[model samples]
Target: RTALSPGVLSPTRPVPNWIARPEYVGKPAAQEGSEPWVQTPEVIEKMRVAGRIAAGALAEAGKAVAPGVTTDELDRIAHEYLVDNGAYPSTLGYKGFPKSCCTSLNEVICHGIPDSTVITDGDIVNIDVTAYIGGVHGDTNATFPAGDVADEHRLLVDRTREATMRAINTVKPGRALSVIGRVIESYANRFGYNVVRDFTGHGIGTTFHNGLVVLHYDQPAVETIMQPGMTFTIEPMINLGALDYEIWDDGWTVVTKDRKWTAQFEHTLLVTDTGVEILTCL
Candidate 1:
């Protein structure tokens, strides 16, 4: 049997009535395997508001990080912050996942449910936050150092963040969608790192999950030309060892299969006539 250090499971937090929700909130995806909604001007304005709310929650969670803090505490703070802003936690009931925010500690990569794990000095953790407001979604995350982290881990975090940044910077009209992953892989290789392929950045807007598959590793450019008002996320998971991962029995947490460290950074982007807008930036 394989050993897995999956974190604690908590009861679902009660959602409020006034908070806006996506179509997938109460039921599973009725219409599976479809494209994400291209935001209209009306939709884009709502998206901008939703994006700002998510950014506030993620920023607050980042500020609460410390050596002795619990992941559960971070969840409480993020959940409250979202609800107070009239936004709902997008990941709360997503696919039966129980947490408001995801806390991926050390080797844990993504979809990590926030719980009782206590932060320790030298640990690296990724806090992922998503919000649903006005029937749209905004998603983003960043890896943070709990205390005096290793110099190597810090380098991994910085480079991984830059990978996503480079990918986002390439968004514009007439650009191939495949360029996103190709750029990410190029930068990761420069630092002797590999990009995780099990999960990818996705198209998100009117729904919690969307169809546009944004890859973070290199491949031939595709035929799709990015148009204005296109919305998607560019989250790059860079590993200290290799490009491998395993899911825990809890059915959510993803960790490096080699048991090595991984860092991920995420930001939702909107394609413009000339460039992109990082909606979730703080």
Candidate 2:
């Protein structure tokens, strides 16, 4: 079982009130319409370019995921890659977020700001990268082994990726959003793992974060039906222990209550007239 230190629940820093604000909570504003979900031809082209840039950044960061490397170095690599490709890191200065990318290690769930901490052997870190190009955005994240990780660490990474892909496959017109949570929970539970409930996926397009909030656990509140042209994400954070999590003093790093291994995978997707298009996969 995972262990939780005393301060994990108390939080060294005060939690940000914006996280609980009604305007930013649950789902964003763009989803509040009946417009059919269909990307224009121009938007589709922009999405392709954004995906290419994001994929390149991920490849570059993944290559540097070894022991003795500081999370800051990975951030620098990602920042350079994005800038070199004529793209911008979406998270930089967004609502006061200070990092080019998010590097969540071990029990950290999501939005972990990159820092000077050196990654050690046996660590599993998730690199969340979002790139803006051609007037659109592409978002994706993957968890990788810092060095020679344990079997459990490998399982967390593999299973989380599998869950992400499986959830993506479920996207289509008329499907309820709740299906994503159901599928994600079922897969994690089958492997004797728990899905992190505090964080969720969201729509991405012209905005860094958009409509159609995607839940990662079994929630009855997410019954919104899918429509064509709806672009969103289904990234799920899987925990090795309980689903409870708390934010760090920085107001971004979300660590598990029980500091066990955690892993996550994400993709920006478009709900097509027929099926789903994984905007970030290519």
Candidate 3:
């Protein structure tokens, strides 16, 4: 049997009253709205701030990953970091997601809710973080190895990051949106890995999951041209086995069908005239 199973979840952590919450906080679903594919100069400046806070929080939580720690603890670290910095944890209460950030363990694809599951040696965990501040959201995530990971699993994590960056580097004015996924799909294919196509990066701004669809797999039909001021995320989930997955009863965690390890890396980006700006970079 795979060493993965649902664990008991602690209660949702609370944000201070002073900290601002997104519009969807108390709603059954995310507020209905539309954000332009291109962000305004003022909104772009706020995105940079939100992205930096998210990056720092992700780094802090990632630094704590190791054998013996609980995924919920990682969420606490990220949650506290965001609120202390006066930003809301974008994932919290959004669409009823309980955790501040997602902590996906080995064999899990993404949206793994943080719970009481303890980290173990030879495990790789992906921590996804997004911070909402200044009426915008900044998103980022990275897969981290716990204690002594297997060499092959380490390579999976490394290659996933490489693929994401390679895709990001292809973003520039006049390039088709298809270029991003084409780069990622081709790179993953070279290593015999499969990219997950169900979930994708999307346009993010004042509202989470704004308007655009950013596919991580090559699709020639998606010909949206990149333009200056455009902002979106490029997060690719790569699996060592089949691309099929199954979601847990909780309606959040997604695990690989073959129960093989997977890894992912994400970054919110800006399309400059010359190239892309990694808004979520440290």
Candidate 4:
């Protein structure tokens, strides 16, 4: 894990403060006053199987990371692995997204469509993959080093992964939803990293995405009390330079304001009677 200077702002355009503000943000819930319900035992088990497929694909893709590997290659590996394992790539053709996996290189925040562009040294890539199997969906993502990344770049990946684990540890029945944001922000602030506000974790089950949008940044958003059997993800995106991000011309890729590197990690979690169960962990 690397650490970067905290107070230095990047030279790129600043992300609007309103984007992170509560009033301007949209709720993750599908309907007003609706909360994500708990999954049944059978459904939860299916989610576990799906998670295994997702985690396996991520692990396989991670081993292929190199300076000359193209994002398209990574996507093909993930798609083939899922198919061979009898699982379906959740993002392919969903809303016209072409790739089976999202490969966001340095400065690209998320939703980066895979292409023939070859990755180079010093680049950090976030591979977001989701899978569907046995009538359930599993979602998870991770950021990996392409080659020798800079100190700030390494710190962003480490801190983002750390923040995600910390927030996941806070999951429990009766815990306030706000606890997730507080823990995530505190960890990022300690390292001088800013949590990305443009995207957040969400509830997952039979649907690829649903209610209970989980935000990782500090804001006035109200907390939803946790209940047993509830399932959702708490992945967080951390930026090395600024909190703001912009979309590329492709209308899908999100890049950092300063063009600095970013990192993210995600896992589908289940709120149990005692603590949270990480469905995506192998």
Winning model by lDDT: 3
Runs in model 3 deviating more than 4 A are: none
Model 2 / residue 167 / CA error / Å: 0.8
lDDT of 1 by residue, 1-282 (tens): 123365566777887876666556666543334764466887777788888889899989988899998888889999999999899998887777778999988888788888887888888889999988887888989988888988999999999988888889899877888899989998999989988887888888887667777788876755667889988889988888866777888888888878888999999889987889999965
Each prediction's Cα lDDT score? 0.83, 0.77, 0.93, 0.78
How much does candidate 4 score in TM-score?
0.86
Please give the clash total of every predicted structure, in order: 0, 4, 0, 1
All candidates: CA RMSD (Å): 2.2, 6.8, 1.0, 9.8
Q: Tell me which residue pairs clash in candidate 1.
A: none
Q: After superposition, which runs of candidate 2 have C-alpha atoms over 4 Å from their true positions?
A: 1-38
Instruction: List the candidates ranked by TM-score, beginning with the highest.
Output: 3, 1, 4, 2
Q: For model 1, what is the error of residue 187's alpha carbon versus the real structure, in angstroms, after optimal superposition?
A: 0.6
lDDT of 2 by residue, 1-282 (tens): 233222212111222332212122223232233433456777877887888789789879988999998777788888778877777777765666766788888888888888867788888888989887776778889998988889988988999999988888998899988998899999999999988776789767666665456798988776589888777778899989887878877888888776777899988888888888888865
Clash pairs detected, candidate 4: 109-254
lDDT of 3 by residue, 1-282 (tens): 255998889997999998889999977898745879898999999999999999999999999999999999999999999999999999999888988999999999999999999999889999999999998999999999998999999999999999999999999999999999999999999999999999898989888898799999989998699999999999999999998889999999999888999999999999997888999977
* Candidate 1 local lDDT, residue 171: 94
Q: Can you give the lDDT of residue 153 in candidate 2?
A: 89
lDDT winner between candidates 1 and 4: 1
Clashes of 3: 0
Residue runs of model 4 more than 4 Å from their true location after superposition: 1-36
- Highest TM-score scorer: 3
